[PDB]
Ligand binder design. Structure first.
Ligand code: CDL
Ligand code: BCL
Ligand code: BPH
Ligand code: BPH
Ligand code: A1EFU
Ligand code: A1EFU
Ligand code: A1EFU
Ligand code: A1EFU
Ligand code: A1EFU
Ligand code: A1EFU
Ligand code: A1EFU
Ligand code: LMT
Ligand code: FE
Lengths: 274, 51, 325, 52, 256, 43, 50, 51, 44, 44, 51, 44, 51, 44
């Protein structure tokens, strides 16, 4: 159904392709040309996962594992039950993610708002793309992508991390991790100000932007502002997604030794006395 | 000669601060390259003497 | 293209804002010294306003510096007061926790005794800062959401260094005070107790850590998308819903079938961030005290994947083949 | 602006020169790049502040 | 303890199930807190829908608004609803877009639609209007970036509609909000406001691409030249963003 | 003519003092360099 | 002497609160240092005398 | 003597809560450092006495 | 004459008298506790 | 004459006399405690 | 020498006294900690040796 | 003249006089403490 | 000479603070340099003299 | 007539007179200190 104010916004137009052929709503969802492709690709990938689970012998969501082909198969296609099903789902997954981002462009174009949300999602897609196709292409085999399992894809992270003998010493991992722990810190503090100002102690008037602006001035000596926090909050999250893509694309295509050995440039500088 | 006119361009308070910082950092840097060498390192040189 | 609100195209600077005040007399503890930075004003507010210094702020800063000095000056003494070596090994030095042989007793100064004294001052400094956050909210007549959220972070901070060492009965279970060393502790902690990936609370805490970055990217971009309708003024949109809140809600309703309000988004934002250390704190507490091996726990509870392929490299290639000879 | 950005451009240009200059006399890329990054921030920052 | 209560159900397993119960209650609480605005659902015809969702409406909460503006209980009738919308259904059923019956930018529908906010200016902590022109503001000036006062304004089709005369700022946060445009006689009559988020400032001009030259004369005006009410802000901003789709047929029709 | 808002007479007065300090700073540096050369020459 | 004038410069509330926290932190610190040593740790000395 | 004037500058409401929590944490801490020692652990000593 | 907390001299004088009664009572119990535990296991 | 905190000179002298009374009482206990510990285990 | 009292015209006595107190104590703890690190000036380790 | 903190020339004289007396008392203790330490364990 | 005119350019309050932290930081650095040398470490030298 | 700090020429000499005295007193101790340590362990 609609909302109390939704009717005045559901106008015709704003599509990127297909016009009014697909321009309608199914329930609350908006269907576009890319909503049709999203439905096809997502459903095809979902069914193929359970088809592979049926042949795997288990339907347990923890134990379902669709794995890439061996490194021997290279960049070519593999038998469906020997790693080819994973490749098809990857094509479906990429098609469903790109369509989802393009569908968001149509929605935000129909509402006359900015395209920040689809652009931010593209960084998430870029991180997924650099894990499943970009990095395997550089390393020369489709078997370097992570498997499609709830707990299996943690084993891929564990072994890939320990393939460089200490993955905490990765300079890009060091930067990327700093962005998660800070984005969550920024999210916690930003969400606290709005909640604290809008929900004061019982019997007290609600607070305006000035009161929360002066709180952090009293608290940490500097306040970034109502607009600045969202502006810097997106940048912290986008940098987190980007630098996480960097830490994994340089592990194997750019660096093959252990990651602690990378810091040997700093230890053995000519300036340091012997 | 007529070099005094530089103060009609440079702010005396803004250049004195820069000159003071530059002079000390330069002095510390030269004092540090001497200690890097094994010939002019007076700390290690004194240890070699009377030993 | 259209102007994306990522950098302000023009900045206006007037008299410094000294902040609001009430009968609590906030101004008598304020520094009243302000400075304006134009570089940071391209993305946020350009004023480095006065800071409220009370007693919880002063106590935390003084005790925090003592912890900083004791850890730092021990590191300098470790390399024999060699400043060039102190800088070179700065990321590698630390103040190691006490040896396991001393249990919960006070160890010698050179073998973790200074670690306990330094940790005592850090504990005082962190708790004092929490009290300052709680006190400031009370004096501003605002909600205590900042203090409660910060208390969630302290919960993992307390568990990781205070509560768990007491339960194991050994001060040696604390985290060393080093840049690289507390990364070494993190890796060694996972290896010692099985595989921390299979800790259900570590998995759950990652869900809320990913969700936190997920949701703040979603919220950060949505507000920037509706900032053309005055969407950055979130507080006024709660009290009087404008077109900015409607379009932001309708964008997500048409995308994923449901949305939030301008206030309710910050309840989602608050809870995912707060649940990140709360769940992790429980997972670290159960590690060592209860389980002692997480992968074997996973095998027992039947959520550890099983593999049927071979393991050696001889089952996939040859040494000569890999070398191309 | 049009001068702070220009002064920043001179800093990054100097950092590239510093990287290749140190590589010529030995050192290494990462060792040279670190001083190039360091020279970018200092000289580039000073130029943007010393003159506007 | 390393002893299990029954089977393989230890203390670690018990804490996991306790969190599952807590999370289910948390999700129920979080979702209901988001239903304070926009409900009941209604349908395309305006009547309340037969389906309302699995989550019931939350209990009423009260906001004690400052500056003597009374209270506000969010779960209830919405005073921001608009009436006499110039739209018609394109289908007899549900789930299909509405077609404007006149000029969408003038009637305020779709991307150009505003919301019936309060007809009073937003106030700062002191109580004075939040957004004021820099002419009234004392001690405020441009400290960085390009000063847009005096630069010509170029519309979305390249037409020059006037020169920027003033610029409205948020003195509470020291942030620029609007730019005043002195419309030329050939394009308009008086002054118009454009929000800072729809204008790109160049060295010699300011460019607004969402509005053509002929659409500037119909931008909503402010009742007074010293302050702007919340309703006027919502009408002015919606007009410019509505031009991103209604300026010409090329924008409305699909790009491919 | 004068970008610092400083008259010609003041600038001439300011330079004479600055020269006096510069020579004194250099004179100490000269004496220090002969001491180092005698103790440990670098030529 | 004339040290009574120190209260004309210092706020009596501020000194007393600062001194109270400072005094306790020393007492806990010095006691902990004594516990660290093998000779001045009175807990193990009692155990050794058994 | 004259110490009663300490209440003329310290708020009794603020002092008592600070004076209250400080006593419990101190008492809890001493009972813990006393339990860590083998000699003074009354829980372990009782088992030893029963043998 | 002086009150940073807005309490007159008379109120503070009797506030302290009640406070000292609790302080001595708390110390009296503590003294017996330390005296009893020294007989049990002396630490000196 | 000079009073940053506001309280008068004769008022300051009254407060300092009490502060020294407490200071000497605290120091007297410390000296006795330090003397007892030195007899127990001297550190010199 | 006899006319150093003018330093209190430039400096505010309030902030100088607070800064001096923090610096003086942080100084005193530094040397005391330095001495405890050495094997020769550790008065706690010396007393054990004499036992 | 030249008042940057509000103090007068005559006001600052006794403030410095007591500060120097406080300085000498603090320094006198340090000399005695240092002299005792050198006798106990000399560092030269 | 007539160097007193430097105070017509430099603010005495801001300069005095600057050299107060500079002088101590310089003194602390030099004292730390000696402690890193075997010949000038007076703490370690006393230990060797005793033995 | 030139002053960027509001200071007067006449009182600038007054400030510099005691600063130089502080310079020589600080330097005199350092010269004695350096002379003492050169006798102890010379670095030349
Ligand atoms: C054509 C399809 C193309 C894709 C096909 C392939 C897709 C594959 C994935 C499919 C996943 C499910 C997709 C959703 C189904 C469609 C939803 C729908 O049409 O409405 C449902 C229908 C409502 O009809 P309607 O068309 O929306 O009409 C308007 C309503 O009447 C008005 O009522 P309202 O205003 O109160 O709001 C209605 C809203 C009300 O719902 C809500 O309020 C949602 C709020 C809670 C969600 C946020 C919490 C999650 C965040 C943390 C997650 C991590 C937790 C991990 C565990 C922690 C430890 C416990 O209902 C929704 O639409 C929400 C749907 C999305 C819910 C979240 C989806 C699952 C996320 C969790 C992942 C689980 C793995 C799934 C993998 C399955 C693979 C087979 O009834 C429901 O609301 C039931 C909810 C459906 C739950 C199913 C979830 C699957 C598990
Ligand atoms: C080999 C490494 C192990 C590993 C070992 C651990 C360990 C060990 C831990 C985690 C924990 C965490 N892991 Mg894990 N983890 C691994 C793999 C991963 C991966 C991945 C992609 O592979 C990810 C994303 C994560 C993610 C996470 C987060 C969910 C979580 C941290 C909570 C948090 O926010 O901390 C933020 C909290 C703090 C930083 C404390 C805050 C301290 C206080 C509040 C601040 C004091 C400030 C201080 C005084 C300095 C102030 C100075 C200022 C300048 C003034 N792990 C592998 C398996 N993981 C934590 C956990 O379990 O949570 C349940 C944890 O302890
Ligand atoms: C800036 C980086 C951060 C980010 C941002 C981000 N994500 C986003 C957005 C943004 C800004 C959206 O707008 C968009 C959205 O609408 O979210 C509600 C989204 C989104 N990111 C999501 C999830 C997600 N984000 C994650 C993280 C992040 N995304 C980063 C922290 C993660 C991680 C790392 O854990 C996940 C799992 C979704 C909720 C949503 C995208 C929804 C979508 O793509 O829908 C279309 C597809 C389907 C309905 C089903 C597709 C099924 C496939 C065809 C088959 C399976 C493929 C897959 C590889 C399975 C693997 C399973 C195993 C790994 C267990
Ligand atoms: C769990 C979700 C996120 C989170 C939440 C969180 N953290 C928080 C909060 C919240 C909600 C706060 O409210 C609180 C805060 O104040 O934020 C501004 C805070 C905070 N958590 C912080 C950081 C932090 N957050 C972290 C992580 C996170 N916490 C997540 C990202 C981590 C990590 C990765 O573990 C850290 C390290 C702090 C910035 C802040 C409160 C810490 C604090 O101020 O403690 C008091 C200590 C001091 C004042 C001094 C500390 C030591 C100084 C370095 C000494 C001074 C040195 C100086 C050079 C002097 C030298 C003198 C000598 C030369 C003599
Ligand atoms: C590595 O370090 C190692 C070696 C480990 C180390 O140990 C380093 C040790 C180092 C550096 C020692 C540093 C210690 C120093 C410097 C000791 C200062 C201690 C002092 C100064 C003690 C004053 C106590 C007096 C009080 C606090 C109250 C008096 C009590 C009365 C009751 C006050 C109230 C009185 C009134 C009359 C009421 C008020 C009146 C009116 C309102 C009218
Ligand atoms: C070996 O190599 C390595 C290791 C790298 C190395 O070491 C490199 C070291 C190198 C390069 C040293 C370079 C340092 C130099 C050059 C520092 C000289 C320092 C100097 C010169 C400063 C003296 C200041 C003393 C005064 C001046 C006190 C005055 C104090 C008094 C008390 C003030 C008087 C009172 C008043 C003014 C009151 C106000 C008056 C009125 C209000 C009227
Ligand atoms: C390893 O551990 C190591 C490190 C060795 C360690 O432990 C280090 C130990 C260290 C440092 C000891 C720290 C010192 C301590 C703890 C001494 C302070 C102790 C004190 C001060 C005792 C107060 C007792 C007061 C009470 C308990 C009740 C009195 C309150 C009464 C009941 C109030 C009445 C209420 C009223 C409202 C009055 C009514 C009147 C009006 C309302 C007018
Ligand atoms: C192997 O090579 C390595 C090591 C790598 C290397 O880099 C080599 C080093 C290299 C290349 C550095 C190149 C050195 C250079 C360029 C030397 C610059 C140094 C200069 C120029 C010295 C100025 C001294 C000026 C003073 C010190 C004045 C004293 C001022 C006095 C105090 C007066 C102040 C004013 C007043 C008192 C009142 C005035 C006001 C009124 C009258 C109103
Ligand atoms: C790596 O380093 C290693 C090698 C480890 C190292 O050790 C190197 C250490 C190095 C270099 C530090 C060198 C330390 C230095 C230089 C510190 C000198 C310390 C000084 C100078 C301070 C003393 C005097 C202060 C007092 C104590 C005043 C007494 C105050 C009195 C009591 C106040 C009286 C006031 C009033 C009554 C107000 C009256 C009010 C009115 C009249 C209104
Ligand atoms: C130039 O300046 C000088 C100054 C010279 C200098 O050197 C500069 C200093 C320098 C460079 C030091 C740089 C510091 C570094 C790298 C430290 C990083 C720090 C890191 C990574 C922190 C790890 C996590 C710690 C946890 C997780 C704690 C948890 C434990 C908490 C605290 C609980 C309390 C613990 C207790 C045991 C309670 C004890 C209490 C009683 C017994 C009552
Ligand atoms: C048997 O024994 C034999 C073998 C015979 C023997 O011993 C052989 C030895 C022989 C022969 C001598 C070998 C040693 C020698 C030669 C020692 C070097 C001597 C040195 C290095 C001299 C130091 C003086 C430096 C100062 C003291 C500078 C003062 C700097 C001042 C402080 C300037 C900074 C102040 C400012 C104000 C500037 C700021 C300005 C503005 C801000 C404008
Ligand atoms: C975003 C860009 C993505 C580019 C992706 C498309 C490029 C993929 C390359 C596929 C290459 C096919 O070539 C394949 O090479 C491998 C190695 C051979 O394997 C032997 C296969 O027999 C051959 O089929
Ligand atoms: Fe927000």
């Amino acid at each position: 159904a609609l909302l109390s104010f939704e009717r005045k916004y559901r106008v015709r137009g704003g599509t990127l392709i297909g016009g009014d052929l697909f321009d309608f709503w199914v329930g609350p969802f908006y269907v576009g040309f890319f909503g049709v492709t999203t439905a096809f690709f997502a459903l095809l990938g979902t069914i193929l996962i359970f088809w592979g689970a049926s042949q795997q012998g288990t339907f347990n969501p923890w134990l379902i594992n669709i794995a890439p082909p061996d490194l021997s198969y290279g960049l070519g296609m593999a038998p469906l039950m020997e790693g080819g099903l994973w490749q098809i789902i990857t094509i479906c997954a990429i098609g469903a993610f790109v369509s989802w981002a393009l569908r968001e462009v149509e929605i935000c174009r129909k509402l006359g708002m900015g395209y920040h949300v689809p652009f931010a999602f593209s960084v998430a897609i870029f991180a997924y793309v650099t894990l499943v196709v970009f990095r395997p292409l550089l390393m020369g085999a489709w078997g370097h992508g992570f498997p499609y399992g709830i707990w299996s894809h943690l084993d891929w992270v564990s072994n890939t991390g320990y393939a460089y003998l200490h993955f905490h010493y990765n300079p890009a991992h060091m930067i990327a991790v700093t962005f998660f722990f800070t984005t969550t810190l920024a999210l916690a503090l930003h969400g606290a100000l709005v909640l604290s100002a809008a929900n004061p102690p019982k019997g007290e008037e609600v607070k305006g932007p000035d009161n929360e602006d002066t709180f952090f001035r009293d608290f940490i000596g500097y306040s970034i502002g109502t607009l600045g926090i969202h502006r810097v909050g997106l940048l912290l999250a986008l940098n987190a997604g980007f630098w996480s893509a960097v830490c994994i694309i340089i592990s194997g295509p750019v660096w093959t030794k252990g990651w602690p050995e990378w810091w040997n440039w700093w230890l053995e500088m000519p300036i340091w006395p012997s | 000669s007529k070099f005094y006119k530089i103060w009609l361009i440079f702010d005396p308070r803004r250049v004195f601060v820069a000159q003071g910082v530059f002079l000390f950092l330069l002095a510390a840097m030269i004092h540090l390259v001497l200690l890097s060498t094994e010939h002019f390192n007076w700390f290690e040189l004194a240890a070699a003497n009377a030993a | 293209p259209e102007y994306q609100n990522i950098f302000t195209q023009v900045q206006v600077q007037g008299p410094a804002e000294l902040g609001v005040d009430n009968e609590n007399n906030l101004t008598e503890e304020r520094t009243t010294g302000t400075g304006f930075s134009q570089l940071i004003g391209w993305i946020g507010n350009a004023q480095l306003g006065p800071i409220y210094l009370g007693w919880f702020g002063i106590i935390s800063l003084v005790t925090g510096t003592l912890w900083f000095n004791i850890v730092g000056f021990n590191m300098l003494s470790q390399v024999g007061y060699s400043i060039p070596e102190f800088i070179r090994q700065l990321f590698w030095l630390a103040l190691e926790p006490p040896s396991p042989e001393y249990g919960l007793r006070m160890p010698p100064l050179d073998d973790g005794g200074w670690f306990i004294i330094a940790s005592f001052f850090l504990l005082v400094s962190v708790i004092s800062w929490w009290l300052r956050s709680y006190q400031l909210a009370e004096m501003h007549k605002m909600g205590k959401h900042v203090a409660w959220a910060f208390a969630a972070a302290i919960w993992l901070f307390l568990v990781l260094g205070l509560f768990r060492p007491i339960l194991m009965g050994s001060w040696s279970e604390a985290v060393p005070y080093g840049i690289f060393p507390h990364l070494d502790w993190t890796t060694a902690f996972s290896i010692r107790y099985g595989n921390l990936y299979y800790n259900p609370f570590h998995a759950l805490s990652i869900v809320f850590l990913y969700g936190s970055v997920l949701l703040f990217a979603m919220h950060g971009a949505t507000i920037l998308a509706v900032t053309r309708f005055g969407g950055d003024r979130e507080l006024e949109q709660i009290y009087d819903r404008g077109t900015a809140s409607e379009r932001a809600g309708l964008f997500w309703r048409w995308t994923m079938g449901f949305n939030a309000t301008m206030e309710g988004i910050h309840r989602w934002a608050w809870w995912f961030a707060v649940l990140t250390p709360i769940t992790g704190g429980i997972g670290i507490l159960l590690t060592g005290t209860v389980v002692d091996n997480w992968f074997l726990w996973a095998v027992e509870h039947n959520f550890a994947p099983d593999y049927t392929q071979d393991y050696g490299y001889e089952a996939y290639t040859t040494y000569d083949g890999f070398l191309g000879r | 602006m049009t001068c702070t950005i220009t002064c920043w451009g001179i800093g990054v240009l100097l950092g590239i020169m510093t990287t290749v200059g140190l590589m010529v006399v030995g050192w290494s890329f990462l060792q040279g790049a670190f001083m190039g990054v360091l020279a970018w921030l200092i000289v580039g920052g000073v130029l943007a502040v010393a003159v506007c | 303890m390393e002893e299990t209560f029954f089977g393989n159900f230890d203390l670690a397993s018990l804490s996991l199930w306790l969190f599952y119960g807590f999370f289910a209650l948390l999700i129920y609480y979080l979702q209901t807190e988001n239903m304070r605005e926009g409900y009941p659902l209604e349908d395309d015809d305006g009547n309340t829908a037969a389906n309302q969702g699995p989550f019931p409406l939350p209990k009423e909460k009260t906001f004690k608004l400052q500056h003597g503006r009374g209270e506000l209980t969010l779960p209830g009738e919405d005073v921001q609803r608009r009436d006499n919308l110039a739209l018609r259904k394109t289908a007899h059923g549900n789930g299909f877009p509405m077609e404007p019956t006149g000029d969408p930018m003038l009637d305020g529908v779709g991307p150009a639609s505003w919301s019936k906010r309060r007809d009073v200016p937003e106030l700062d902590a002191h109580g004075h209007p939040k957004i004021v022109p820099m002419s009234a503001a004392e001690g405020f000036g441009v400290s960085a970036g390009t000063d847009p006062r005096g630069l010509p304004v170029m519309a979305g089709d390249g037409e020059i509609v006037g020169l920027v005369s003033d610029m409205w700022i948020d003195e509470a946060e020291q942030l620029v909000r609007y730019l005043e445009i002195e419309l030329d006689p050939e394009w308009g009559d008086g002054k118009r406001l454009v929000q800072r988020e729809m204008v790109r400032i160049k060295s010699d001009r300011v460019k607004v691409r969402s509005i053509y030259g002929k659409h500037f004369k119909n931008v909503p005006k402010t009742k007074s030249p010293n302050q702007v009410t919340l309703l006027e802000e919502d009408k002015i901003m919606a007009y410019y963003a509505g031009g991103t789709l209604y300026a010409d047929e090329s924008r409305l029709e699909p790009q491919l | 003519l004068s970008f610092t808002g400083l008259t010609d007479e003041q600038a001439q007065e300011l330079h004479s003092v600055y020269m006096s300090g510069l020579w004194l700073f250099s004179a100490v540096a000269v004496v220090a360099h002969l001491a180092t050369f005698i103790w440990r020459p670098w030529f």
